[PDB]
Design a protein around this ligand. Sequence first.
Ligand SMILES: Nc1ncnc2c1ncn2[C@@H]1O[C@H](COP(=O)(O)OP(=O)(O)O)[C@@H](O)[C@H]1O
Ligand SMILES: Nc1ncnc2c1ncn2[C@@H]1O[C@H](COP(=O)(O)OP(=O)(O)O)[C@@H](O)[C@H]1O
Ligand SMILES: [Mg+2]
Ligand SMILES: [Mg+2]
Lengths: 304, 304, 220, 220, 350
Amino acid sequence: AKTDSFLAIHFKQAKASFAALWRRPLGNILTLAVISMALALPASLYLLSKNIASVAERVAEPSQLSVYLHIDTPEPRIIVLKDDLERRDEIAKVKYISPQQGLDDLSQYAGFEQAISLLDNATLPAVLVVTPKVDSREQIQTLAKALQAEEGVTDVRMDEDWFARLDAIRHLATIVVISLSSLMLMSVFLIVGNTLRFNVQANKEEIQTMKLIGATDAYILRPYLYSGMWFGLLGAVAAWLLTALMTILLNGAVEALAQLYDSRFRLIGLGWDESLLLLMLGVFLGCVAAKVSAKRHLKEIEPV
Amino acid sequence: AKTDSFLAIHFKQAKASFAALWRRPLGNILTLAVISMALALPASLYLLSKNIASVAERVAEPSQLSVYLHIDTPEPRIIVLKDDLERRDEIAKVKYISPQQGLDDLSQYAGFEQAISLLDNATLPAVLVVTPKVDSREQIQTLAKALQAEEGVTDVRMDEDWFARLDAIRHLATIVVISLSSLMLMSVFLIVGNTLRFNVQANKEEIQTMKLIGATDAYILRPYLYSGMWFGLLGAVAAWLLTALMTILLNGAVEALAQLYDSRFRLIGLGWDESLLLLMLGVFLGCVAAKVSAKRHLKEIEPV
Amino acid sequence: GVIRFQQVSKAYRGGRQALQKVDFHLRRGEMAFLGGHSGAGKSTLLKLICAIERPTDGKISFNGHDITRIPNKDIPFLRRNIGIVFQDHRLLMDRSIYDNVALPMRIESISENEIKRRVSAALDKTGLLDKARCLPSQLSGGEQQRVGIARAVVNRPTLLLADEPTGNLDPELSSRVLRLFEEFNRAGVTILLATHDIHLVNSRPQYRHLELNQGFLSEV
Amino acid sequence: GVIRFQQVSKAYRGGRQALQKVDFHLRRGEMAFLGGHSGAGKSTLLKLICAIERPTDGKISFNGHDITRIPNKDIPFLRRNIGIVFQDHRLLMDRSIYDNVALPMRIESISENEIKRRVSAALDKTGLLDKARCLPSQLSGGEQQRVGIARAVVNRPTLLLADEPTGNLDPELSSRVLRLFEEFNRAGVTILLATHDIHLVNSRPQYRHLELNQGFLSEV
Amino acid sequence: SLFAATQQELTGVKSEISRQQQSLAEQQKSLDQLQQALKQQELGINSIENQITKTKNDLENANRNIAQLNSNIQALETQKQQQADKLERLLQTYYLTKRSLTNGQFFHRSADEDRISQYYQHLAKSRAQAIEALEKTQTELNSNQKQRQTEREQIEKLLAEQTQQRDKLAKTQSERKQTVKKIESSISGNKTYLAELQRNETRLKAEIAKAAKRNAVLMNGIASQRGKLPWPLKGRVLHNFGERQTGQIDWKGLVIDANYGQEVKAVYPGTIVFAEYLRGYGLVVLLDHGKGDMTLYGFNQTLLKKEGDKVTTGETIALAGDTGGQSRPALYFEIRRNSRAENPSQWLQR
Ligand SMILES: Nc1ncnc2c1ncn2[C@@H]1O[C@H](COP(=O)(O)OP(=O)(O)O)[C@@H](O)[C@H]1O
Ligand SMILES: Nc1ncnc2c1ncn2[C@@H]1O[C@H](COP(=O)(O)OP(=O)(O)O)[C@@H](O)[C@H]1O
Ligand SMILES: [Mg+2]
Ligand SMILES: [Mg+2]
């Protein structure tokens, strides 16, 4: 008895399943649109996050280390400490700010044209800054901290991501990312399941007859697997198109803002490597959801 | 042959529809969670948009210039100086803040109630606000220098007047909010319809039996309308709770940020009016989606 | 009369004609057998009478009111007057027997107490009062058919239509089901039974017999 | 033999027992009628034989291979050997007749040309070759039943099971269907027909008759 | 009848003698009651005087605490003014450099945001520390002032107590003078006074004998210090040893005029053997110098030393007074050797 090869049956099933979507255009189009939008949401969020991160990195990437001396230290000892720091290695470049200079800086920051009065000369402690002579950030930071501790410096505020801190980036950003990822997974993993359950229900009699005759379970299941795979792939493509359209929409608004600031900037779309990952994620979610939901719903359908 | 009251049948149908959700826990729970998340996200986006708009409106002041008189300056001298400044050209208007009015403004902030009481006689300098007639920065600087040299002041403070940057940021936020809100509303509207279609397909036999008997169309349609309404209500309530739980965290993060400086800031949450509108929108969307989907799928079912 | 036809004929889309110039009249209280062959128009006639499918040539009168072009919004009111029994004894396996028999009443939104009393009366009349709280799966075939008849007749229909109600039962239960239909007719409910079993119709010649042959009704 | 039972009995969850100590043996080529009453175990027997429901007491042997505890993964291979005919003539209305009759072959993933030739042969044997490209809706009841028989027998089954195949046909077509089954038996296909019609079985006494009564099989 | 007159006359004389004895007994009983009343009055005056001195000492102690509290309050006021000025200027600086976010006062262009934030945080921390210290010092000052006011109120109570004691002492002194006057008027009879003097002198010997047999002082005695003993008190001698005090009773010691409250200094070191109130001598302090040599100091208003206490030469043992019914303050000095009274003039330095 002649039997088709392993690949021929799979290719026929794929083509037939793709052709089957046109039997119910509206039902299979609304689900595709929903999947596309649900997958495009996180894509656009990631795009904006990447753009802002690139802007932040681009603005400036120098390295400077600041050390705050204790208020208790008197003025004459400041010169001695400056000389000692200069003598030691890795301290080639040093700048010192007098308390009067700090007061002037503070007055300028608040918008006063001239240094504010009635603050006295003891408003702020003296501050010194040391440039990083050694490229080793960790070793340089450790050495600076040890030196400051030896000299009795109250605080050692080495340059770092103060804005990121442990409040916004540590918690809020992670929570938002987790929430968006969960929404993406549930929305895609849900609507795909319901559509395939509905399709299986619409073919109750055919499945009953097929099981009665003696068809194997895998033969029953495969068409829905391929339908889900097609759903995922088409949804991923639609999501990519939607993100591209959104970037086109925001190009002008971002250009207006970037022009005003010094840094001239332009929106950048998803990289060509990212598109492959997007398609892989779409097809993976489609296949997994289809397999799980179709098998679970197909368990409870007896031949008679 | 007695018929129940018009309201009684509707109430019974609503109760039955609410009880129906327990038939299939997983699907109903997942769709409800997705609806809640998709209704919560636009709420948070709108909240951020409203906060940015409020800040932009506050910053709308035309770069008003503040002048501080000496603490010991006599009150008649302050009045004479204010009159002279008003008489002087290039000054649009003059506002005088009394020392006790400034004391009240300062006491508005937290942590200052105790100190003011402890001090025998708190004496803030008389703060006077002068609005330049010309918004030009050069004119502002010249007027500030002239006021400092007027020989009747101790300090002068000037504003930032960064209106354009905040306007651009507001425009960008508006575009992003509109786009994402539209996508989420479409997604939630379409997700409901699919679940209603699947539910209608589930009980095909009962619908066929009822239509074979002289059942009316409205009787068959009502339960699905009420199921959609319950979906909308529960989703909207969950979305409001999520929005509150998100605004608390956002307020905490912003307070932590502003704590770096000595000042503090608080977020303006969605008002009592917003919650009612959110519930109304959720109910309307759910009911309309359920009605359209269920009716369209119901037209295509024959008793035999 | 309870129903009358005036040269009614039906032609399917394919081009095959189930009915061609069929004319018969039913007076209230009468019973008929509507015999036919494997083809003929028995099922098509039963579908036409209850307005599931519209005619093409003639006109149909139920109680002097034309049913030829009844608007689709009035079909439920018409169907409320007609009870239908099918060979398949369509039953909702999920629900209980008391629920299946009570569906026609609940469709009209009747009070619970009246529904209970009426359903109890009907089930007692058909002899299934004892098993009113059981599922249809447990019942045997004859019990299922009797439950179907009770569900059909609960709502005091003026005309009762049976579409080969005895298809899936041996003659022993055929006699019982036919006797039950006879009792319902004695109660005053018009009936139009439909069957291709010549033996059953020949058993009882009291009721007028209409033979349907290739879409033509001899009425003899 | 083609099938053998050893004190097999089935008890439903409700507590009602369809079968109790039923024992019969079939030799290849034979035909049986399996008469029974409205209750009895005809349908339960036909369900048991094709492994749709498992037994409780005894053992079942198909060709010397125990089917009592066949793993669920081997059921399709067993069902491929058995053809089943039902009173409802289960047919897929959407597809064409050539597609309905070709489903058993396509399930095995057979080449298109062999499928075409075999389906044409089967349809010619049942006399429906002309309408191989039409939909089942257009066909009459007898034609639909013959299409069902062809679909059942296309795959050269060793044992053919019929579950009241003549439920929805008048005796005139009953004779034709029974003659078709007789021809298939002459071809060498074992058959176990099931019917409650005493007249039909009494018509042809050549084939051994097994009477099933309240779950007991007299075999006389 | 002639012989019976003598017996009858004796009965009449005996009746008169018995009546005189009964009158003398009643007079003696009245004198004893007057003596008992005077002893209570004299003891009460000494007790009242001691209480007045104690109260005065307490008042003096309070005064110094009052000065310390006043100095602490002045220091606290100076610190409060300094800290109030500091807090005022710091609060004014904050009012100048508010930097409120909602008004677009954040993120000044082209500035070291981290460093300016550190400046602001340090300023806020300094403000918090300043207000905490101000509250602490103000609370301490308020608590001290409340305690200081209570101390003044307590002083008021002490003053009230001292005033009441002074009035009682004045009343007691007047009563003692009246009691002394009554005794003197009733002692107008020469016979009665002489008998009372003998009993008091006899009482002194018994007390001296008992004290001598109790504490056997191991001192070397005052024999080697004849003619060099310092005068116990500075005053004019009123009665010399051997002078006729009343009738046939001659003074056994030296009576030296002394001012009220005058300090009495021990002539030589010794151990106190009798520091109780004796009838007819007031407060009497007996000092034993060993070898049977003892010195007695009577009429003291108050006794500072107690029985068994050691006393050094020149140490104040008691305060001169008018105890013992004396009409004027004086100190009775008597020197006894081997239970025999010796003339003090021969022992005291010239
Ligand atoms: N949906 C249809 N389309 C075309 N022809 C049909 C349809 N239904 C039935 N027919 C044909 O119309 C005729 C009516 O047959 P019918 O009265 O239903 O037989 P029965 O009473 O045994 O059920 C038959 O020849 C049947 O094949
Ligand atoms: N799913 C079931 N659960 C419990 N009892 C059943 C079930 N199906 C059938 N029965 C009972 O088991 C017995 C078997 O009857 P059956 O052989 O199916 O009659 P028939 O051959 O006419 O179809 C009957 O009494 C029937 O009521
Ligand atoms: Mg029919
Ligand atoms: Mg059966």
